[PDB]
Amino acid sequence: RDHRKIGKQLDLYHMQEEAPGMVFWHNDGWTIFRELEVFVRSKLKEYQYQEVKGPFMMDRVLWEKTGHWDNYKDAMFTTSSENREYCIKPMNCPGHVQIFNQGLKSYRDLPLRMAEFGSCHRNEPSGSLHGLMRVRGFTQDDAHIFCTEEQIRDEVNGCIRLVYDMYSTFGFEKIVVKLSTRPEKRIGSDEMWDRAEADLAVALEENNIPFEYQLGEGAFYGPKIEFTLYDCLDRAWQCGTVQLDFSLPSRLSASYVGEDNERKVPVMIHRAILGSMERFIGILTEEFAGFFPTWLAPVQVVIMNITDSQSEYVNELTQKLSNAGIRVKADLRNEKIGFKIREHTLRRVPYMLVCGDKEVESGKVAVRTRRGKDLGSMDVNEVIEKLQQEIRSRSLKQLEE
Amino acid sequence: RDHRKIGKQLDLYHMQEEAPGMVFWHNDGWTIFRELEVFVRSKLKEYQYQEVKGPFMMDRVLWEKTGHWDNYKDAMFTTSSENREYCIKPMNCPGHVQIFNQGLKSYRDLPLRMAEFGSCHRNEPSGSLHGLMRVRGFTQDDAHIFCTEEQIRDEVNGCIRLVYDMYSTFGFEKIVVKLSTRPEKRIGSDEMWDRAEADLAVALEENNIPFEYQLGEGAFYGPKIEFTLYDCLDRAWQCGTVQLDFSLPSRLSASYVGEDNERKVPVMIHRAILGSMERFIGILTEEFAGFFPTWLAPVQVVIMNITDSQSEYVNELTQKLSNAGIRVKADLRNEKIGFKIREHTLRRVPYMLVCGDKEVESGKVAVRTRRGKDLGSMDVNEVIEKLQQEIRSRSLKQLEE
Numbered sequence A, B: 001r002d003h004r005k006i007g008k009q010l011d012l013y014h015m016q017e018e019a020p021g022m023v024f025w026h027n028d029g030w031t032i033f034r035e036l037e038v039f040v041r042s043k044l045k046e047y048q049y050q051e052v053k054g055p056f057m058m059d060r061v062l063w064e065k066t067g068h069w070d071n072y073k074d075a076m077f078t079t080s081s082e083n084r085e086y087c088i089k090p091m092n093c094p095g096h097v098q099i100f101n102q103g104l105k106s107y108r109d110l111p112l113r114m115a116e117f118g119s120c121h122r123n124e125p126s127g128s129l130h131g132l133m134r135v136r137g138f139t140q141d142d143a144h145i146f147c148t149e150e151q152i153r154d155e156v157n158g159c160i161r162l163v164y165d166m167y168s169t170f171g172f173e174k175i176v177v178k179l180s181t182r183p184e185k186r187i188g189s190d191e192m193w194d195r196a197e198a199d200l201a202v203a204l205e206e207n208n209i210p211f212e213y214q215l216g217e218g219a220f221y222g223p224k225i226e227f228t229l230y231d232c233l234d235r236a237w238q239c240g241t242v243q244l245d246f247s248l249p250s251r252l253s254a255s256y257v258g259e260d261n262e263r264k265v266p267v268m269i270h271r272a273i274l275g276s277m278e279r280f281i282g283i284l285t286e287e288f289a290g291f292f293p294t295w296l297a298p299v300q301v302v303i304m305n306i307t308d309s310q311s312e313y314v315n316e317l318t319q320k321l322s323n324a325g326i327r328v329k330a331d332l333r334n335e336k337i338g339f340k341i342r343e344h345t346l347r348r349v350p351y352m353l354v355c356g357d358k359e360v361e362s363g364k365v366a367v368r369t370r371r372g373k374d375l376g377s378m379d380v381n382e383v384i385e386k387l388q389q390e391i392r393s394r395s396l397k398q399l400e401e
Ligand SMILES: C[C@@H](O)[C@H](N)C(=O)O
Pocket: B090, B091, B092, B093, B142, B143, B219, B241, B270, B271, B272
């Protein structure tokens, strides 16, 4: 259950000194990352989020208008062009405000939900770098909600539901919650936080979610809720965050005309469910011990022949599953069937279809799982239907288990 | 047909002084970008390419070894960390070779086609920047094919086929081809350049493709076949590029075991079809004058009620088309129906479905196209099926045209 070892055995990715903390995603590891994105996007559509994409660098001047330069200066990568300094973005927040600032906004537009899978970089100390868990280049399932204070509570409940919704898909049911409160050095009236923290606590209650407080550990711009997952070895992983922000929209001159024909500054919610996706893949790799559920498996099916006499039939079936949207590969090597099955099992390929003369004659396939299960012979289309259903529902378990 | 104006008009994207030559994709523009991406991926699958993701930056020492520092220094953004210098990548090739170098390779593994939607940055002179066509930050529909010298003919032919294939999807049939030869500043011997230039010249001749030389315009590492397409305004746009490289693999220590079990350096073919996603979207915007084919349209269908009477029916139908994979929006504003239809026509929404009391009891919808054509009352499932077919075939024309 070490993701670094598994990542090498399954040829998912690799790292090297020429790019500390920046993942070289191989075909198979990138397939998992892309399927995660597909999954998140399905939630974006469901919970009604826009998806945008911001540039990787912006003038040091704009970053200074946020405050990110005092708190993050030491973690930002800077570069330049024609005598102007630019910072490689360490977060997507400012960029999303720039998008909001384009076009007159009114209460009729709020709540405005803006998501993005945009890579960020932080010049983390090389010594603290570790596999997919602590990196310099990372992509969070980031989003920002611009709303009025009268919408906050409903928005937080929206994020709450999404959290448990996504976590349950990967089998994570044990979730600990912590609501960090007002720190000594903050930006806002004690009155403000009273309402802010109230919103967070009431929202957690409307969902019956026990929680503890991390007194004085909120950000200077607002209180927050963090969700910590527990994997099968009972290890905790903080991944979810719902951060209220009462100072960023103001510093970047964001505003809208309220129903009271006046000009107000929207409230900004920062939320991420999985957190760093590179890290999340590392957590799942260890949680599944490399046995990724079929919807995430780099290669879902390998079809193999006994002798080069079923080769033609194997290719035929490989095209069918492929056209069916299944990640399938044909193993026509000159190796014994047991050698092939052993290899694909070690690679954790969910299903293996064996094709001997018997299967060719009947137009069926002998089905086996990576768990050593004999699933009998099946018609090609029965297999395809069963697999599409397992993939579509993102089922954690295979056929028969 | 000014992509800059259309882009602001349809809320596709925007640029600002704090990040010159770098695009902010708004929801609708990003939707187009993502659909293009889905299209390219359908081709990567059909043409048998792997898809990977490399690091955003790599050690300057790596770039010195490739020759990029000596021949490409001016175009590169640099940054540092822990007394080390890093170049934000201007190209994806070196990263692809690093991935290639992980794990022993044999002739059995070739040709190995490795694609990436590579985020690249080139510090282009500010004065030469222009909308989406000339930018500093872009996304290349890049790939590198690692092959033997004997496979060069077939692999180059594959890239050539891929160029005409993809361009035809967008209605670009008039294509002019050119061969850019050895530049003043280059790496590799005159013998290697003679051979690489001849291989490409012969590939064009064998394909009976007339061409003209672009003397001294090759890449510092190899000659290239460049493809220029023409839009409906008979304007020329250079986009596609196929490059033959006998230098970078050797310099980056790439090798594979030949059939004669001898160690060999693989040949590397570089190719991008669209060039950059950004520029291609700029071209498409002018080509279609904002009237994006349905598969690309940000919002494919807008459903409108007349009065509150039909609000319930509209919500139901929208929910229904959305489940059918169609990008749909309901417009229940208390506005005259014509005002609504006008606004959406202005937005180039392919189809507008109007619902009056009649449609509601009828269980149908009144269909109008953004070109102002009246398609009459249609069964809801009939439109859904027809829209799905138009989207799936990536057709350039709407119902009735
Ligand atoms: C096409 C791509 O692979 C090449 N390196 C280029 O940027 O020109």
